[PDB]
Structure 1
Amino acid sequence: MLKNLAKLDQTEMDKVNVDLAAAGVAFKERYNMPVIAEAVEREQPEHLRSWFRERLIAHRLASVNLSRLPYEPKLK
């Protein structure tokens, strides 16, 4: 109703944060700069290891697409 703590929930955002790390691993194409597949993997809590894996496919799509919607202008 008001308290809304259940929304921000450290676990809720934990889940969202893990994907970002996964995306970072997709920066392995950009391995012309430093990317540690070990680190990202180990940064993700083994508990939800599957989540990293599943998200990895998602981030693979997002890596190969290139698009991703960067900055660009585009304003009404």
Structure 2
Amino acid sequence: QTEMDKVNVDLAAAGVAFKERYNMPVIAEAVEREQPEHLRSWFRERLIAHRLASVNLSRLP
């Protein structure tokens, strides 16, 4: 159940990427409350991995 919390961290941390498309209601500060300090170390890296992902978006080929 340990990774059950961990996997949710990646979910919330992905909301920061939607900032590049703020055409819809997206509370970027909501993730700051949903993500406790107990996972700040993981969230820190999550931001790096996600901020680089929004650059390429998806890209299948």
Give the TM-score normalised by structure 2. 0.83
Partners in 1 of 2:59 and 2:27 — Cα distance? 22
Superposed displacement of residue 51, structure 1: 1.1
Q: Classify 1:58/1:68 alpha carbon distance in 2 versus 1 (closer, same or farther; 3 Å).
A: farther
Partners in 1 of 2:44 and 2:59 — Cα distance? 20
Q: What's the Cα RMSD here?
A: 1.4
- Whether the 8 Å contact between 1:18 and 1:52 is mirrored in structure 2 is yes
Structure 1: 4+ residue segments shifted above 6 A: none
* Larger RCO (CA under 8 A, 6+ residues apart): 2
**Higher alpha-carbon Rg:** 1
Identity %, equivalent residues? 100
Uncovered stretches (5+) of structure 2, i.e. residues with no partner: none
Matched, 1:43 2:54: no
Aligned residues: 60
